[PDB]
Amino acid sequence: SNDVAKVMKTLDGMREGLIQTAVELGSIEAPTGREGAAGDYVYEWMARNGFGPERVGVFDDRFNVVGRLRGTGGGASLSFNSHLDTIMAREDTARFADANDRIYHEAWHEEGRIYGYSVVNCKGPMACWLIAAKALKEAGAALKGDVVLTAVCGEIDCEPVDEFQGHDYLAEDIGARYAISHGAISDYALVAEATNFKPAWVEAGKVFLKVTVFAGPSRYTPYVPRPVAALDSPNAIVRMAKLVEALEEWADNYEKRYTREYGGGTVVPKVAIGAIRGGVPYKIYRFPELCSIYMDIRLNPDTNPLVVQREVEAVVSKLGLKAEVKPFLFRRGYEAQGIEPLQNALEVAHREVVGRPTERPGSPECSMWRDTNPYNELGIPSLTYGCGGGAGGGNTYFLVDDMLKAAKVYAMTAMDLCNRTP
Amino acid sequence: NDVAKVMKTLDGMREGLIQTAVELGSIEAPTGREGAAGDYVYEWMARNGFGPERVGVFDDRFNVVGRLRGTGGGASLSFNSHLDTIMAREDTARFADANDRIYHEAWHEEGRIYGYSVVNCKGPMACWLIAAKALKEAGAALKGDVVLTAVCGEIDCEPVDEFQGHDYLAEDIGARYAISHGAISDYALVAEATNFKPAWVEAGKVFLKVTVFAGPSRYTPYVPRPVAALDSPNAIVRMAKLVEALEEWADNYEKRYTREYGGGTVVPKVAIGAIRGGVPYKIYRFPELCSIYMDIRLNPDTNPLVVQREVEAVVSKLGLKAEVKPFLFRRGYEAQGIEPLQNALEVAHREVVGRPTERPGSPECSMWRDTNPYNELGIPSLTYGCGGGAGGGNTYFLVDDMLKAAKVYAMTAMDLCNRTP
Numbered sequence: 048s049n050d051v052a053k054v055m056k057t058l059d060g061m062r063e064g065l066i067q068t069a070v071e072l073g074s075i076e077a078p079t080g081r082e083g084a085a086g087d088y089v090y091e092w093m094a095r096n097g098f099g100p101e102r103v104g105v106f107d108d109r110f111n112v113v114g115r116l117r118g119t120g121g122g123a124s125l126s127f128n129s130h131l132d133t134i135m136a137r138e139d140t141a142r143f144a145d146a147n148d149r150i151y152h153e154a155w156h157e158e159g160r161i162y163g164y165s166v167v168n169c170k171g172p173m174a175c176w177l178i179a180a181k182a183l184k185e186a187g188a189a190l191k192g193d194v195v196l197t198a199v200c201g202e203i204d205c206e207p208v209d210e211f212q213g214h215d216y217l218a219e220d221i222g223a224r225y226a227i228s229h230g231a232i233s234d235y236a237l238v239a240e241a242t243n244f245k246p247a248w249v250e251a252g253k254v255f256l257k258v259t260v261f262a263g264p265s266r267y268t269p270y271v272p273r274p275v276a277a278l279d280s281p282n283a284i285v286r287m288a289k290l291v292e293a294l295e296e297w298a299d300n301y302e303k304r305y306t307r308e309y310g311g312g313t314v315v316p317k318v319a320i321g322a323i324r325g326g327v328p329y330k331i332y333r334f335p336e337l338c339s340i341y342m343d344i345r346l347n348p349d350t351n352p353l354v355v356q357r358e359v360e361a362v363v364s365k366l367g368l369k370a371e372v373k374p375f376l377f378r379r380g381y382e383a384q385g386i387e388p389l390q391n392a393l394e395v396a397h398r399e400v401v402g403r404p405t406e407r408p409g410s411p412e413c414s415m416w417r418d419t420n421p422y423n424e425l426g427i428p429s430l431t432y433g434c435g436g437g438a439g440g441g442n443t444y445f446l447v448d449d450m451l452k453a454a455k456v457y458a459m460t461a462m463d464l465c466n467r468t469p
Numbered sequence: 470n471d472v473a474k475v476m477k478t479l480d481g482m483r484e485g486l487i488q489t490a491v492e493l494g495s496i497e498a499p500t501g502r503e504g505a506a507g508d509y510v511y512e513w514m515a516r517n518g519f520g521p522e523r524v525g526v527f528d529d530r531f532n533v534v535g536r537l538r539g540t541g542g543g544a545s546l547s548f549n550s551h552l553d554t555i556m557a558r559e560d561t562a563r564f565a566d567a568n569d570r571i572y573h574e575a576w577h578e579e580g581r582i583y584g585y586s587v588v589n590c591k592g593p594m595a596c597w598l599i600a601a602k603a604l605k606e607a608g609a610a611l612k613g614d615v616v617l618t619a620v621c622g623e624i625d626c627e628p629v630d631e632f633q634g635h636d637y638l639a640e641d642i643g644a645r646y647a648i649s650h651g652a653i654s655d656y657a658l659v660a661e662a663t664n665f666k667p668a669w670v671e672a673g674k675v676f677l678k679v680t681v682f683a684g685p686s687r688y689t690p691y692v693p694r695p696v697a698a699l700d701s702p703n704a705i706v707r708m709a710k711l712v713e714a715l716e717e718w719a720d721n722y723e724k725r726y727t728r729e730y731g732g733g734t735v736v737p738k739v740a741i742g743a744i745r746g747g748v749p750y751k752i753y754r755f756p757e758l759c760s761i762y763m764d765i766r767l768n769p770d771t772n773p774l775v776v777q778r779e780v781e782a783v784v785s786k787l788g789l790k791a792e793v794k795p796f797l798f799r800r801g802y803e804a805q806g807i808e809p810l811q812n813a814l815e816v817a818h819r820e821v822v823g824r825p826t827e828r829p830g831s832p833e834c835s836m837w838r839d840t841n842p843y844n845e846l847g848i849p850s851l852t853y854g855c856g857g858g859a860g861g862g863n864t865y866f867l868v869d870d871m872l873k874a875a876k877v878y879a880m881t882a883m884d885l886c887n888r889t890p
C-alpha cells in the first residue's frame with residue numbers, strides 16, 4: 048500500500064545525497080584498469096550505511112564490491128548491478144582527438160543535470176540504486192528476500208591481445224562473471240545502465256578478430272619497386288588499405304543480414320575496425336612484411352563465432368590476399384529466460400513513477416555488451432534499465448529529476464519482487 | 470587407407486609416448502604452480518611445429534594453445550587436457566602421507582606408467598599430443614583444423630575468505646579463459662580418464678561456507694558444565710552436532726537429485742571438505758564461531774539457491790544460529806549437437822577396441838571436467854580416455870591402453886575434421 052509512499056517520501060528528501068554521491072563517485076579517476084579507488088569509495092559507502100560489503104576480486108587493486116540488504120526471510124533475491132570503470136583514460140591519446148577534455152574525466156552538477164561520461168557510464172545509475180537501497184533500509188521497508196548490491200569492475204570491452212597481457216588489460220573476465228561465480232548470486236538481477244527508461248533483456252555477444260595481411264619481401268626504401276598494383280604491393284600496409292574498404296562494405300551488409308528480433312529487443316549487430324598497426328614508428332626505413340587490423344564484431348545470441356570468421360576469411364580470399372584471421376575474444380550474448388517476474392515488477396513501478404507503459408528498447412542498447420549476459424548465462428534472469436541516453440551515443444549528462452525517478456523505480460521493483468516466495 | 474598409415478606411425482611412437490608422459494608427469498605442478506608444466510608443453514608443441522601461444526591471466530599460470538592447420542573447409546576439433554595435478558607436497562592437511570611418491574612422481578614399470586600426475590592428467594594429454602604428431606608426420610589429409618589445448622587450473626581449488634588471488638585461483642583462469650580468448654572450435658574432446666567410455670553430461674557445483682554461532686567466550690576455568698551440546702557456548706561443539714545432521718542430509722541428497730541424461734547418469738554428491746575454528750595457537754578460550762566448508766555437486770537442472778535453502782533448513786531444524794554463505798557456483802551441462810563427434814568417436818573406438826562403447830560410470834558424469842566450459846560456450850563436448858579415474862583412485866595406466874587411446878584420438882580427428890560444418 049503506502050509502504051511505497053513512505054519510501055517515496057524518503058527518497059524525495061535524499062535528492063541532495065543522490066547528487067553528491069553521483070558527483071563524488073563520478074569525479075574519481077577510474078578507467079578500466081584502475082578502478083581500485085572507485086571500488087574503495089563504494090566499499091566504504093556501503094560500509095557506512097551498513098550493507099556489510101566484501102571485496103570480491105582477482106587482483107587486490109581491481110575487485111568487485113558486494114553488499115546486501117538482508118530480508119526477514121522467505122523471499123526472492125534481487126541483485127542491483129552497475130560497473131566501477133569508465134571509458135576514457137587521460138592516457139589514450141591514440142583514440143581521442145582531445146584525450147584531456149573535461150567531459151571525459153570529471154563530473155559536476157550544473158543546472159540540475161549532472162555532466163560527465165563517468166556519470167552516464169556508470170556512476171550514475173549506480174548512485175541511483177545505492178540511494179534506493181539506503182531508502183529501503185531507513186524507511187524500514189518490509190522485505191522477505193535479500194537485496195544484493197553488486198558494484199563490479201571490468202564491464203567495459205577492453206581485452207588483452209598479443210603482448211598486452213595480464214593485470215593491466217583484463218576486464219570482463221574478472222568482473223561480473225567472477226563476482227557471481229563466487230557468491231553474488233540471486234534469483235533475479237537488474238543491471239542499472241542507461242536506457243531511456245526502456246527495459247531490455249536481450250544483449251549481444253561479440254567476437255574480436257585480428258586480421259594480419261602478409262606481403263614482402265622487405266626492401267630498403269631506395270629499392271622499393273614502383274609502380275605496382277595495390278594488391279600486389281610488397282608493402283603490407285598498402286594491401287591492408289585495400290582490404291579495409293572491402294571489409295567496410297562487408298560490415299555494411301552484416302548488420303542488416305544478422306538483424307534479429309527478440310522479445311527483449313531487436314538486435315542490430317554492428318562491426319568496427321578498432322585498431323591498426325604495422326610495423327613500428329621508430330624504424331620506418333623498411334616497409335612492413337605484415338600488417339594487422341583489429342575488428343569488433345557483435346553477435347546476436349544465435350550466431351556462432353566461427354561462421355563470422357569464415358565470412359571474413361572469404362572477403363580476404365576474394366581479394367587474393369594471404370592473411371591470418373585469428374579470433375582473440377569470444378563471448379556469448381543471451382536473451383533472458385523466465386524474466387516475467389522482474390519484467391512485471393519493474394513494469395508496475397515504471398507506470399507509477401513515469402506514467403505510461405514501457406516502450407521497446409532502442410537497438411543499440413540491445414546490441415551491446417552489458418552485464419545482463421553473465422547473469423543470464425548463469426541462470427539468473429536479468430534485464431537492464433536506467434535513465435538517459437547511452438554513453439556510446441554519446442549522451443554526456445543526466446537530469447537530476449530522472450535519476451530520482453529511477454531510484455524510485457528501483458526501490459519499488461525491489462519491494463514487489465523481494466516479497467515473492469521463490 | 471590414409472588411416473592404416475597413421476596407425477602404423479603410432480605403433481612406432483610408443484617410446485615417444487612413454488617418454489612424453491613420464492617427463493611430463495615428473496614435473497611438480499599442483500594447482501597454483503602449473504607454470505613449469507606449461508613451459509614444457511609449449512616447448513614440446515614448438516619443437517613439433519604446432520605454433521603454440523601462451524594464453525593466461527598470469528605469466529606463470531597460463532594455458533597453452535596450438536594448432537594443426539587443415540587444408541580448408543572442415544569442422545574444427547579441440548583436444549583438451551589440464552596441466553595441474555592434485556597433490557602438492559605442502560598438503561599435510563589433506564593426506565596422511567603427503568610425501569608419498571605416487572602423489573608426486575611418474576615412472577615406467579610393467580608396461581604401466583605410475584603416478585597420480587599421470588592419471589590426472591599428463592598422459593591423456595600425452596596421448597593426444599602424440600596423436601597430433603602422428604597425424605602431422607603421416608601427412609594425413611584434414612580439411613578442418615585440430616586445436617591442441619593444454620589448460621591450467623582445471624582442478625576444483627577455489628579462493629575463499631582470506632585466501633585470494635594468484636595463488637588460489639583455478640578454473641576462472643583455465644579452460645574457459647582459453648576458450649573465451651581464442652581457443653575456439655566446432656567440437657571439443659576433453660581427454661581425461663574414463664574407461665574408454667564416453668560421457669557428455671557433467672555436474673555443476675555450489676560451495677557453501679556454514680558458520681555456526683555460539684558464545685559467550687569464556688576462559689577455560691569458567692566454562693559452564695554440563696550443558697547440552699546444542700546449547701554449548703563452544704561453537705565447535707554445536708558444529709559437531711550439525712555435521713551429523715548434514716551427513717544425513719547428504720546421504721539423501723545424492724539419491725533425490727539423481728538424474729539420468731542421454732549423456733550419462735548424474736549422481737551429485739556432498740562432502741564436508743574443511744572445518745576450522747578458531748586458531749590453534751590461542752586455545753584458552755573456546756570460539757564463539759566455527760565454520761564448515763561444503764562441496765555440493767549439482768545436476769545441470771538444479772538451482773544453487775534451492776540447495777542453500779535446504780541446508781539453511783537443516784540448521785533451522787536444530788535450533789542453531791548459522792550463516793550459510795555460497796562462495797562458488799558453476800553450472801554443469803549436457804552437450805547439445807554432440808552427434809557428429811559422438812559418431813566419429815564411436816566409429817574410431819569400435820575399430821581400435823573392437824566392441825561398442827559402454828555407458829560411463831556415474832562418477833565420471835557427476836564431476837567437474839572441462840567439457841563444461843566448452844558446452845557453456847556452444848562447443849559440443851565429451852570426455853574420453855583410458856584407465857580408471859584418479860578420484861578412484863587409479864594410480865597407473867597401461868601403456869597398451871594409452872596407445873589405444875591415441876589411436877582413437879587420431880581416427881576421431883580424421884573422420885570429424887573431414888565432415889562439412
Ligand SMILES: O=C(O)c1cc([N+](=O)[O-])ccc1O
Nearest residue numbers: 134168203240241437438439
Ligand atoms: O552502457 C554503455 O553505454 C556503455 C558504453 C560503452 N562505450 O561507449 O564504450 C562501454 C560500456 C557501456 O556499458
Ligand SMILES: O=C(O)c1cc([N+](=O)[O-])ccc1O
Nearest residue numbers: 555589624625661858859860
Ligand atoms: O579428472 C579427474 O578425475 C579429476 C580428479 C580429481 N580429483 O580426484 O581430485 C580432480 C580433478 C579431476 O579432473
Ligand SMILES: [Mn+2]
Nearest residue numbers: 168169202240
Ligand atoms: Mn556501461
Ligand SMILES: [Mn+2]
Nearest residue numbers: 589590623661
Ligand atoms: Mn582431471
